[PDB]
Amino acid sequence: SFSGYLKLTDNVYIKNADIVEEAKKVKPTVVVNAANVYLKHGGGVAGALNKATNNAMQVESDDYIATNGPLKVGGSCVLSGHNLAKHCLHVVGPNVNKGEDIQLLKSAYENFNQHEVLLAPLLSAGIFGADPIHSLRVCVDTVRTNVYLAVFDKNLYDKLVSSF
Ligand SMILES: O=C(O)C[C@@H](NC(=O)c1ncnc2[nH]ccc12)c1ccc(F)cc1
């Protein structure tokens, strides 16, 4: 059901789209969230996905943290996708604006290999502060399963495709 995506490799596809609108249209098995270790979904992709769930994502996330403690940078957990997908894979890429190690970006993308197909944002890009051209290269060199990337910023999408 994914449509209008540009094929970058055998398994990586990309589109200039709002991941919330894409998830509402496709209802994928898995939507990836650009999470932090506390699952505090304030801004960026996380804030937008949580708002689309009417805060149900944050209520579920707070119960998960109260039981399990925080995730590791480079780690993930599978929770409900609520009204957006069957599941949400919350993945923690390093936040360069918080001083985190960019070398953990490959470990973050490895979580995608546990799922046959995913709708996802570009990890550690945007307000997480990493070079998005680097994030796209690590994605295509790490993920082996079928990944549909939704890039919100139009200017960024154009820059990523022309430089790929
Ligand atoms: O412009 C971009 O694609 C990069 C940016 N993505 C979004 O904020 C983004 N991407 C897709 N759908 C969206 N809907 C509402 C926001 C949103 C970003 C990626 C990872 C991250 F950790 C933080 C931000």
Coordinates of N, CA, C and O and ligand atoms in Angstrom, one line a residue:
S1 N 0.8 -1.2 0.0 CA 0.0 0.0 0.0 C 0.8 1.3 0.0 O 0.2 2.4 -0.1
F2 N 2.2 1.2 0.1 CA 3.0 2.4 0.0 C 3.0 2.9 -1.5 O 3.1 2.1 -2.4
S3 N 2.8 4.2 -1.6 CA 2.8 4.8 -3.0 C 3.5 6.1 -3.1 O 3.7 6.8 -2.1
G4 N 4.1 6.3 -4.3 CA 4.8 7.5 -4.6 C 6.2 7.6 -4.0 O 6.8 8.7 -3.9
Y5 N 6.8 6.4 -3.6 CA 8.2 6.4 -3.1 C 9.2 6.2 -4.2 O 8.9 5.5 -5.2
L6 N 10.3 6.9 -4.0 CA 11.4 6.8 -4.9 C 12.3 5.6 -4.4 O 12.6 5.5 -3.2
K7 N 12.7 4.7 -5.3 CA 13.5 3.6 -4.9 C 15.0 4.0 -4.9 O 15.5 4.5 -5.9
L8 N 15.6 3.9 -3.7 CA 17.1 4.2 -3.6 C 18.0 3.0 -3.8 O 19.0 3.1 -4.5
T9 N 17.6 1.9 -3.2 CA 18.3 0.6 -3.3 C 17.3 -0.5 -3.4 O 16.1 -0.3 -3.5
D10 N 17.8 -1.8 -3.4 CA 16.9 -3.0 -3.4 C 15.9 -2.9 -2.3 O 14.7 -3.4 -2.6
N11 N 16.2 -2.3 -1.1 CA 15.2 -2.4 0.0 C 14.9 -1.1 0.6 O 14.2 -1.1 1.6
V12 N 15.5 0.0 0.2 CA 15.3 1.4 0.8 C 14.5 2.3 -0.1 O 15.0 2.4 -1.3
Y13 N 13.4 2.9 0.3 CA 12.5 3.7 -0.5 C 12.4 5.1 0.3 O 12.5 5.1 1.5
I14 N 12.1 6.2 -0.4 CA 12.0 7.5 0.2 C 10.9 8.4 -0.4 O 10.7 8.3 -1.6
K15 N 10.3 9.2 0.4 CA 9.2 10.1 0.0 C 9.2 11.4 0.8 O 9.5 11.3 2.0
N16 N 8.8 12.5 0.2 CA 8.7 13.8 1.0 C 7.2 13.7 1.5 O 6.3 13.9 0.7
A17 N 7.1 13.4 2.8 CA 5.7 13.2 3.3 C 5.8 13.3 4.9 O 6.9 13.2 5.5
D18 N 4.6 13.7 5.4 CA 4.4 13.7 6.9 C 4.2 12.2 7.3 O 3.2 11.6 6.8
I19 N 5.0 11.7 8.1 CA 4.9 10.3 8.6 C 3.6 10.0 9.3 O 3.1 8.9 9.2
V20 N 2.9 11.0 9.9 CA 1.6 10.8 10.5 C 0.6 10.6 9.4 O -0.2 9.6 9.5
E21 N 0.6 11.4 8.4 CA -0.4 11.2 7.3 C -0.1 9.9 6.5 O -1.1 9.2 6.2
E22 N 1.2 9.6 6.3 CA 1.5 8.3 5.7 C 0.9 7.1 6.5 O 0.3 6.2 6.0
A23 N 1.2 7.1 7.9 CA 0.7 6.1 8.7 C -0.8 6.0 8.7 O -1.4 4.9 8.6
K24 N -1.5 7.1 8.7 CA -3.0 7.1 8.7 C -3.5 6.5 7.4 O -4.6 5.8 7.4
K25 N -2.8 6.7 6.3 CA -3.2 6.1 5.0 C -2.9 4.7 4.8 O -3.7 3.9 4.3
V26 N -1.7 4.2 5.2 CA -1.2 2.9 4.9 C -1.6 1.9 6.1 O -1.8 0.7 5.8
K27 N -1.7 2.4 7.3 CA -1.8 1.6 8.5 C -0.8 0.4 8.5 O -1.1 -0.8 8.4
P28 N 0.5 0.8 8.5 CA 1.5 -0.2 8.3 C 1.6 -1.1 9.5 O 1.1 -0.8 10.6
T29 N 2.3 -2.3 9.4 CA 2.5 -3.2 10.5 C 3.3 -2.4 11.6 O 3.1 -2.6 12.7
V30 N 4.4 -1.7 11.1 CA 5.3 -1.0 12.0 C 5.5 0.4 11.5 O 6.0 0.6 10.4
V31 N 5.3 1.4 12.4 CA 5.8 2.7 12.3 C 6.9 3.0 13.3 O 6.8 2.6 14.5
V32 N 8.0 3.5 12.9 CA 9.2 3.8 13.7 C 9.0 5.3 14.3 O 8.7 6.2 13.6
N33 N 9.2 5.4 15.6 CA 9.3 6.6 16.3 C 10.8 7.0 16.6 O 11.6 6.1 17.0
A34 N 11.1 8.3 16.3 CA 12.4 8.8 16.8 C 12.3 9.2 18.2 O 12.1 10.4 18.5
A35 N 12.5 8.2 19.1 CA 12.3 8.4 20.5 C 13.6 8.9 21.2 O 14.7 8.8 20.7
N36 N 13.4 9.3 22.5 CA 14.5 9.5 23.5 C 14.4 8.3 24.5 O 13.4 7.6 24.5
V37 N 15.4 8.2 25.3 CA 15.5 7.1 26.3 C 14.4 7.1 27.3 O 14.1 6.0 27.9
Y38 N 13.8 8.2 27.6 CA 12.7 8.3 28.6 C 11.3 8.2 27.9 O 10.3 8.3 28.6
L39 N 11.3 8.0 26.6 CA 10.0 8.0 25.9 C 9.1 9.2 26.2 O 7.9 9.1 26.3
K40 N 9.8 10.4 26.3 CA 9.0 11.6 26.5 C 8.8 12.2 25.1 O 9.8 12.7 24.4
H41 N 7.6 12.1 24.6 CA 7.3 12.4 23.2 C 6.9 13.9 23.0 O 5.7 14.2 22.8
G42 N 7.9 14.8 23.1 CA 7.6 16.2 23.1 C 7.5 17.0 21.8 O 6.7 17.9 21.6
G43 N 8.4 16.7 20.9 CA 8.6 17.4 19.7 C 9.1 16.6 18.5 O 9.2 15.3 18.7
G44 N 9.3 17.1 17.4 CA 9.7 16.4 16.2 C 8.8 15.3 15.8 O 7.5 15.4 16.1
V45 N 9.3 14.1 15.3 CA 8.5 13.0 15.0 C 7.7 12.5 16.2 O 6.5 12.2 16.0
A46 N 8.4 12.4 17.3 CA 7.7 11.8 18.5 C 6.5 12.6 19.0 O 5.4 12.1 19.2
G47 N 6.7 13.9 19.0 CA 5.6 14.8 19.4 C 4.4 14.8 18.4 O 3.3 14.7 18.9
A48 N 4.7 14.7 17.2 CA 3.7 14.6 16.1 C 2.9 13.2 16.1 O 1.7 13.2 16.1
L49 N 3.7 12.1 16.3 CA 3.0 10.8 16.4 C 2.1 10.7 17.7 O 1.0 10.3 17.6
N50 N 2.7 11.2 18.8 CA 1.9 11.2 20.0 C 0.6 12.0 19.9 O -0.4 11.6 20.4
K51 N 0.7 13.2 19.4 CA -0.4 14.1 19.2 C -1.5 13.4 18.4 O -2.7 13.4 18.7
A52 N -1.1 12.7 17.3 CA -2.1 12.0 16.5 C -2.8 10.8 17.2 O -3.9 10.4 16.8
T53 N -2.2 10.3 18.3 CA -2.8 9.2 19.1 C -3.6 9.9 20.3 O -4.0 9.1 21.2
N54 N -3.8 11.2 20.3 CA -4.5 11.8 21.4 C -3.9 11.6 22.7 O -4.6 11.4 23.8
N55 N -2.5 11.5 22.8 CA -1.7 11.2 24.0 C -1.7 9.8 24.5 O -1.1 9.5 25.5
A56 N -2.4 8.9 23.8 CA -2.4 7.5 24.2 C -1.0 6.9 24.1 O -0.6 6.1 25.0
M57 N -0.2 7.3 23.1 CA 1.2 6.8 23.1 C 2.0 7.2 24.3 O 2.8 6.4 24.9
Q58 N 1.8 8.5 24.8 CA 2.6 8.9 26.0 C 2.1 8.1 27.3 O 2.9 7.7 28.1
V59 N 0.8 7.9 27.4 CA 0.3 7.2 28.6 C 0.8 5.7 28.6 O 1.4 5.3 29.6
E60 N 0.8 5.1 27.4 CA 1.4 3.7 27.4 C 2.9 3.8 27.6 O 3.5 2.9 28.3
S61 N 3.6 4.8 27.1 CA 5.1 4.9 27.3 C 5.4 5.1 28.7 O 6.4 4.6 29.2
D62 N 4.7 5.9 29.5 CA 4.9 6.2 30.9 C 4.8 4.9 31.7 O 5.7 4.7 32.6
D63 N 3.8 4.1 31.4 CA 3.7 2.8 32.1 C 4.9 1.9 31.7 O 5.5 1.2 32.6
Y64 N 5.4 1.9 30.5 CA 6.5 1.1 30.1 C 7.8 1.5 30.9 O 8.5 0.7 31.4
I65 N 8.0 2.8 31.0 CA 9.2 3.3 31.7 C 9.1 3.0 33.2 O 10.1 2.6 33.8
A66 N 7.9 3.2 33.8 CA 7.7 2.9 35.2 C 8.1 1.4 35.5 O 8.6 1.1 36.6
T67 N 7.8 0.5 34.6 CA 8.1 -0.9 34.8 C 9.5 -1.3 34.4 O 10.1 -2.1 35.2
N68 N 10.1 -0.7 33.3 CA 11.4 -1.2 32.8 C 12.5 -0.3 32.9 O 13.7 -0.7 32.6
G69 N 12.3 1.0 33.2 CA 13.4 2.0 33.2 C 13.7 2.4 31.8 O 13.1 2.0 30.8
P70 N 14.6 3.4 31.7 CA 14.9 4.0 30.3 C 15.5 3.0 29.4 O 16.2 2.0 29.8
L71 N 15.4 3.3 28.1 CA 16.1 2.6 27.0 C 17.5 3.0 27.0 O 17.9 4.0 27.7
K72 N 18.3 2.3 26.2 CA 19.7 2.7 25.9 C 19.7 3.6 24.6 O 18.9 3.3 23.7
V73 N 20.7 4.5 24.5 CA 20.9 5.1 23.2 C 21.4 4.0 22.2 O 22.3 3.3 22.6
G74 N 20.7 3.9 21.1 CA 21.0 2.8 20.1 C 20.0 1.7 20.3 O 20.0 0.8 19.4
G75 N 19.1 1.7 21.3 CA 18.2 0.7 21.6 C 16.8 1.0 21.1 O 16.5 2.0 20.5
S76 N 15.8 0.0 21.4 CA 14.5 0.2 21.0 C 13.5 -0.6 21.9 O 14.0 -1.5 22.6
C77 N 12.2 -0.4 21.7 CA 11.2 -1.2 22.3 C 10.0 -1.2 21.3 O 9.8 -0.2 20.6
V78 N 9.2 -2.3 21.4 CA 8.0 -2.4 20.6 C 6.8 -2.1 21.4 O 6.6 -2.8 22.5
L79 N 6.0 -1.1 21.1 CA 4.8 -0.8 21.8 C 3.6 -0.8 20.8 O 3.8 -1.1 19.6
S80 N 2.4 -0.4 21.2 CA 1.3 -0.4 20.3 C 1.4 0.8 19.3 O 2.0 1.8 19.6
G81 N 0.9 0.6 18.1 CA 0.8 1.6 17.1 C -0.5 2.5 17.2 O -0.7 3.4 16.4
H82 N -1.4 2.1 18.2 CA -2.6 2.9 18.4 C -3.4 3.0 17.1 O -3.6 1.9 16.5
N83 N -3.9 4.2 16.8 CA -4.6 4.3 15.5 C -3.8 4.5 14.3 O -4.4 4.7 13.2
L84 N -2.5 4.4 14.4 CA -1.6 4.7 13.3 C -1.0 3.5 12.6 O -0.6 3.6 11.4
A85 N -0.8 2.4 13.3 CA -0.1 1.2 12.8 C -0.5 0.0 13.8 O -0.9 0.3 14.9
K86 N -0.1 -1.2 13.4 CA -0.3 -2.3 14.4 C 0.7 -2.0 15.6 O 0.3 -2.0 16.7
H87 N 2.0 -1.8 15.3 CA 3.0 -1.6 16.3 C 3.7 -0.3 16.1 O 3.9 0.2 14.9
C88 N 4.3 0.3 17.1 CA 5.3 1.4 17.0 C 6.6 0.8 17.6 O 6.7 0.4 18.7
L89 N 7.7 0.9 16.7 CA 9.0 0.6 17.2 C 9.7 1.9 17.6 O 10.0 2.8 16.7
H90 N 9.8 2.1 18.9 CA 10.5 3.3 19.4 C 11.9 3.1 19.4 O 12.5 2.2 20.1
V91 N 12.7 3.8 18.5 CA 14.1 3.7 18.4 C 14.9 4.9 18.8 O 14.4 6.0 18.4
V92 N 15.9 4.8 19.6 CA 16.7 5.9 20.1 C 18.0 6.1 19.3 O 18.9 5.3 19.5
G93 N 18.0 7.0 18.4 CA 19.2 7.4 17.8 C 20.0 8.4 18.6 O 19.3 9.1 19.5
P94 N 21.3 8.6 18.5 CA 22.0 9.6 19.3 C 21.5 11.0 18.9 O 21.3 11.3 17.8
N95 N 21.4 11.8 20.0 CA 21.1 13.2 19.8 C 22.3 14.0 20.0 O 22.9 14.2 21.1
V96 N 22.8 14.5 18.8 CA 24.1 15.3 18.8 C 23.9 16.6 19.6 O 24.8 17.1 20.2
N97 N 22.6 17.2 19.6 CA 22.4 18.5 20.4 C 22.5 18.2 21.9 O 22.5 19.2 22.7
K98 N 22.4 17.0 22.4 CA 22.6 16.5 23.8 C 24.1 16.0 24.0 O 24.3 15.5 25.0
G99 N 24.9 16.0 23.0 CA 26.3 15.5 23.0 C 26.5 14.0 22.9 O 27.6 13.5 23.1
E100 N 25.5 13.3 22.4 CA 25.6 11.9 22.2 C 26.5 11.4 21.0 O 26.6 12.1 20.0
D101 N 27.1 10.2 21.2 CA 28.0 9.7 20.2 C 27.3 9.2 18.9 O 26.6 8.2 18.9
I102 N 27.6 9.9 17.8 CA 27.1 9.6 16.5 C 27.4 8.2 16.0 O 26.6 7.6 15.2
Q103 N 28.5 7.5 16.5 CA 28.8 6.2 16.2 C 27.7 5.2 16.6 O 27.5 4.2 16.0
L104 N 26.7 5.6 17.5 CA 25.6 4.8 17.9 C 24.5 4.8 16.9 O 23.5 4.0 17.0
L105 N 24.6 5.6 15.8 CA 23.5 5.6 14.8 C 23.4 4.2 14.1 O 22.3 3.8 13.8
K106 N 24.6 3.5 13.8 CA 24.4 2.2 13.1 C 23.7 1.2 14.1 O 22.8 0.5 13.6
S107 N 24.0 1.2 15.4 CA 23.3 0.3 16.3 C 21.8 0.6 16.3 O 21.0 -0.3 16.3
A108 N 21.4 1.9 16.3 CA 20.0 2.3 16.2 C 19.3 1.7 15.0 O 18.2 1.1 15.1
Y109 N 19.9 1.9 13.8 CA 19.3 1.3 12.6 C 19.2 -0.2 12.6 O 18.3 -0.8 12.0
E110 N 20.2 -0.9 13.3 CA 20.1 -2.4 13.4 C 18.8 -2.9 13.9 O 18.3 -4.0 13.6
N111 N 18.1 -2.1 14.8 CA 16.8 -2.5 15.3 C 15.8 -2.7 14.2 O 14.9 -3.5 14.4
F112 N 16.0 -2.0 13.1 CA 15.0 -2.2 12.0 C 15.0 -3.6 11.4 O 14.0 -4.0 10.8
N113 N 16.2 -4.3 11.5 CA 16.3 -5.6 10.9 C 15.5 -6.7 11.5 O 15.4 -7.7 11.0
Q114 N 14.9 -6.4 12.7 CA 14.0 -7.3 13.3 C 12.5 -7.3 12.7 O 11.7 -8.0 13.3
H115 N 12.3 -6.4 11.7 CA 10.9 -6.3 11.2 C 11.0 -6.3 9.7 O 11.9 -5.6 9.1
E116 N 10.2 -7.1 9.0 CA 10.2 -7.3 7.6 C 10.0 -6.0 6.8 O 10.6 -5.8 5.7
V117 N 9.1 -5.1 7.2 CA 8.8 -3.9 6.5 C 8.4 -2.8 7.6 O 7.8 -3.1 8.6
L118 N 8.9 -1.6 7.4 CA 8.7 -0.5 8.3 C 8.5 0.8 7.6 O 9.1 1.0 6.5
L119 N 7.6 1.7 8.1 CA 7.5 3.1 7.8 C 8.4 3.9 8.8 O 8.1 3.7 10.0
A120 N 9.3 4.7 8.4 CA 10.3 5.3 9.3 C 10.7 6.7 9.0 O 10.8 7.0 7.8
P121 N 11.2 7.5 10.0 CA 11.8 8.8 9.7 C 13.4 8.5 9.6 O 13.9 7.4 9.9
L122 N 14.1 9.5 9.2 CA 15.5 9.4 9.1 C 16.1 9.6 10.5 O 16.0 10.7 11.1
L123 N 16.7 8.6 11.1 CA 17.1 8.7 12.5 C 18.2 9.8 12.7 O 19.1 10.0 11.9
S124 N 18.1 10.4 13.9 CA 19.0 11.5 14.4 C 19.1 12.7 13.5 O 19.9 13.6 13.8
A125 N 18.2 12.9 12.5 CA 18.1 14.1 11.7 C 17.2 15.1 12.4 O 16.8 15.0 13.5
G126 N 17.0 16.3 11.7 CA 16.2 17.3 12.3 C 16.7 17.8 13.6 O 17.9 18.1 13.7
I127 N 15.8 17.9 14.6 CA 16.2 18.5 15.9 C 17.1 17.5 16.7 O 17.6 18.0 17.7
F128 N 17.4 16.3 16.2 CA 18.4 15.5 16.9 C 19.9 15.9 16.4 O 20.8 15.5 17.1
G129 N 20.0 16.8 15.5 CA 21.3 17.4 15.2 C 22.3 16.7 14.3 O 23.4 17.3 14.1
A130 N 22.1 15.5 13.8 CA 23.1 14.8 13.0 C 22.9 15.3 11.5 O 21.9 15.8 11.1
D131 N 24.0 15.0 10.7 CA 24.0 15.3 9.3 C 23.0 14.3 8.6 O 23.2 13.1 8.7
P132 N 21.9 14.8 8.0 CA 20.9 13.8 7.4 C 21.5 13.1 6.2 O 21.1 11.9 6.0
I133 N 22.5 13.6 5.5 CA 23.1 12.8 4.4 C 23.8 11.6 5.0 O 23.7 10.5 4.4
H134 N 24.5 11.8 6.1 CA 25.2 10.7 6.8 C 24.1 9.7 7.3 O 24.3 8.5 7.2
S135 N 23.0 10.2 7.9 CA 22.0 9.3 8.4 C 21.4 8.4 7.3 O 21.3 7.1 7.5
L136 N 21.2 8.9 6.1 CA 20.7 8.2 5.0 C 21.7 7.1 4.5 O 21.3 5.9 4.2
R137 N 23.0 7.5 4.5 CA 24.0 6.5 4.1 C 24.1 5.4 5.1 O 24.1 4.2 4.7
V138 N 24.1 5.6 6.4 CA 24.1 4.6 7.5 C 22.8 3.7 7.3 O 22.9 2.5 7.4
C139 N 21.7 4.3 7.1 CA 20.4 3.5 6.9 C 20.6 2.5 5.7 O 20.4 1.3 5.9
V140 N 21.0 3.0 4.5 CA 21.1 2.1 3.4 C 22.2 1.0 3.6 O 22.1 -0.1 3.1
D141 N 23.3 1.4 4.3 CA 24.4 0.4 4.6 C 24.1 -0.5 5.8 O 25.0 -1.4 6.1
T142 N 23.0 -0.3 6.5 CA 22.8 -1.2 7.7 C 21.5 -1.9 7.7 O 21.4 -3.1 8.1
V143 N 20.4 -1.3 7.2 CA 19.1 -2.0 7.2 C 19.0 -2.9 5.9 O 19.3 -2.5 4.8
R144 N 18.6 -4.1 6.2 CA 18.4 -5.2 5.1 C 17.0 -5.5 4.8 O 16.7 -6.1 3.8
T145 N 16.1 -5.1 5.7 CA 14.6 -5.3 5.6 C 14.1 -4.1 4.8 O 14.8 -3.1 4.4
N146 N 12.8 -4.1 4.4 CA 12.2 -3.1 3.5 C 11.8 -1.9 4.3 O 10.9 -1.9 5.2
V147 N 12.4 -0.8 4.1 CA 12.2 0.5 4.8 C 11.7 1.6 3.9 O 12.3 1.8 2.8
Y148 N 10.6 2.2 4.3 CA 9.9 3.3 3.6 C 10.2 4.5 4.4 O 9.6 4.7 5.5
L149 N 11.1 5.4 4.0 CA 11.4 6.6 4.7 C 10.6 7.8 4.3 O 10.4 8.1 3.1
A150 N 10.0 8.5 5.3 CA 9.2 9.7 5.1 C 10.0 10.9 5.7 O 10.4 10.9 6.8
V151 N 10.3 11.8 4.7 CA 11.1 13.0 5.1 C 10.1 14.1 5.0 O 9.5 14.4 4.0
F152 N 9.9 14.8 6.2 CA 9.0 15.9 6.2 C 9.4 17.2 5.5 O 8.6 17.7 4.7
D153 N 10.6 17.6 5.7 CA 11.1 18.9 5.1 C 11.3 18.8 3.6 O 12.2 18.0 3.2
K154 N 10.6 19.6 2.8 CA 10.7 19.5 1.4 C 12.1 19.8 0.9 O 12.7 19.0 0.0
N155 N 12.7 20.8 1.4 CA 14.1 21.2 1.0 C 15.1 20.1 1.3 O 16.0 19.8 0.5
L156 N 14.9 19.5 2.5 CA 15.8 18.4 2.9 C 15.6 17.2 2.0 O 16.6 16.6 1.5
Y157 N 14.4 16.8 1.7 CA 14.1 15.7 0.7 C 14.9 15.9 -0.6 O 15.6 15.0 -1.1
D158 N 14.8 17.1 -1.1 CA 15.4 17.4 -2.4 C 16.9 17.3 -2.3 O 17.5 16.8 -3.2
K159 N 17.5 17.8 -1.2 CA 18.9 17.7 -1.0 C 19.4 16.3 -0.9 O 20.4 15.9 -1.4
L160 N 18.6 15.4 -0.1 CA 19.0 14.0 0.1 C 19.0 13.3 -1.3 O 19.9 12.5 -1.5
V161 N 17.9 13.5 -2.1 CA 17.8 12.7 -3.3 C 19.0 13.2 -4.3 O 19.7 12.3 -4.8
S162 N 19.2 14.5 -4.4 CA 20.2 15.0 -5.4 C 21.6 14.6 -5.0 O 22.4 14.4 -5.9
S163 N 21.9 14.4 -3.7 CA 23.2 14.0 -3.3 C 23.5 12.5 -3.0 O 24.6 12.1 -2.6
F164 N 22.4 11.7 -3.3 CA 22.5 10.3 -2.9 C 23.5 9.5 -3.8 O 23.3 9.6 -5.0
Ligands
LIG1 O1 12.5 16.7 8.2 C1 12.8 15.6 8.5 O2 12.3 14.6 7.9 C2 13.7 15.2 9.7 C3 12.9 15.1 11.0 N1 11.6 14.5 10.7 C4 10.5 15.0 11.2 O3 10.4 15.8 12.1 C5 9.2 14.3 10.7 N2 9.4 13.3 9.8 C6 8.3 12.8 9.2 N3 7.1 13.1 9.5 C7 6.9 14.0 10.4 N4 5.7 14.5 10.8 C8 6.0 15.5 11.8 C9 7.3 15.6 11.9 C10 7.9 14.7 11.1 C11 13.5 14.3 12.2 C12 13.9 13.0 12.0 C13 14.4 12.3 13.1 C14 14.4 12.9 14.4 F1 15.0 12.4 15.4 C15 13.9 14.2 14.5 C16 13.4 14.9 13.4

